[PDB]
């Protein structure tokens, strides 16, 4: 019963689609792409769309896109805010490669859910907290 | 109070707990493993879970995975799909070493937390954007 | 609105609101070797308002700019992480030689709801269909 308005790059560009058992949808790679070991590429995944007011989107690698690409997104999570809905403001997963690697147009190279922005805050400024340290880094140990 | 169902591939795994101060829930390799430079592995967790009706899991690595284990999570935030739930359905960590490594059964190696699944979404194909 | 406390580390951090994410800036210089670790320090500890805790990624520019991953991914902000010198730090792995100055935005936050507390029941067996995972979708 939401709607997110999604344009496409063109008519090659491959559908996107929820399936079933996929609680995020897969994007897909609008062209072929070739990455060398060690080097970057920003791959066009060949949507924008218009999210619902007051939502972000977020966008990671599936759980196969190492196995299958060999790349890793740079950035680690993206986060698309509802205020990039331009009719070019299209969508690029940042890889890099940690080994040659082959990306073919329509492949499923990542994914993305939406959810609610975070509410609004102010931040105010304080000489002191007043609170004990938690620690952090490993403070817990591993065992 | 929201129940999750944990079932553990066998007796040895070290059951896991929630702590006061962990706002997201440790989770352990299930056996050792050792990890070459510049290699993969999907390090086992040895366990399968029931979530909560209409909730995904969410999967990270510590803070202190990569200085204890020289481990990066390669998916960057794991995405455990509520119908990942069969008796086979067992979780685990993508790991690439950074350097060579050695895990140990019952290490803590990555953290979870539960939420929400994402609404029905109706995608709309439009030819321009406003 | 919320209020979320913030604690600079000393007069020299550069001072930090509609739902956006939130730029968090290095706290001193930071020199990494290629194929090198080192903490950034963010300058910053906070008390989060009640039930939250925070999410650190970086910067979409944060690669482009600087040539580090963040080797957590995702950090997260416990909402007991809220002491003195409880400072926040992004986990920085640099692919080439580089160079933070003090004050360069390299990562953001923003708040969530954390997890309730959930009960976990251990159960001798699921009963449900396997979905299989890593991956059982294929690629076309
Ligand atoms: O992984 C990402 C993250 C962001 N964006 C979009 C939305 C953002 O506003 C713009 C600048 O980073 O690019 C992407 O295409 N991919
Ligand atoms: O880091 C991950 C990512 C996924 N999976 C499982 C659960 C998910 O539903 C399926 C495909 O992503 O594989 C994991 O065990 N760990
Ligand atoms: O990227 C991170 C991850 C964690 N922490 C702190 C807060 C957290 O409560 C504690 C343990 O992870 O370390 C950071 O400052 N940055
Ligand atoms: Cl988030
Ligand atoms: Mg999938
Ligand atoms: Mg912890």
Redesign the interface.
């Known amino acids: 019963?939401?709607?997110?308005?999604?344009?496409?790059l063109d008519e090659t560009q491959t559908?996107?689609?929820?399936?079933?058992?996929?609680?995020?949808?897969?994007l897909r790679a609008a062209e072929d792409v070739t990455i060398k070991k060690?080097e970057?590429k920003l791959v066009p995944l060949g949507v924008?769309?218009?999210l619902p007011e007051?939502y972000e989107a977020h966008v990671?690698?599936?759980?196969?896109?190492?196995?299958?690409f060999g790349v890793?997104?740079?950035?680690?999570?993206?986060?698309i805010?509802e205020s990039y809905?331009?009719?070019n403001?299209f969508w690029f997963f940042?890889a890099?490669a940690?080994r040659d690697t082959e990306i073919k147009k329509?492949?499923?190279?990542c994914?993305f859910?939406?959810?609610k922005?975070?509410?609004?805050?102010?931040?105010?400024?304080?000489?002191?907290?007043?609170?004990?340290?938690?620690?952090?880094?490993?403070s817990?140990?591993?065992?």
């Open positions: 019963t939401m709607q997110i308005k999604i344009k496409y559908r996107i689609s929820k399936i079933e058992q996929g609680d995020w949808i897969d060690d970057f924008a769309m218009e007051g990671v690698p599936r759980s196969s896109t190492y196995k299958n890793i997104q740079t950035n680690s999570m993206g986060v805010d809905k331009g009719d403001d940042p890099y940690l329509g492949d499923r190279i994914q859910r939406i959810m922005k975070m509410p609004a805050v102010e931040l105010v400024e304080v000489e002191h907290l007043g609170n004990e340290d938690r620690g952090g880094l490993g817990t140990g591993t065992k």
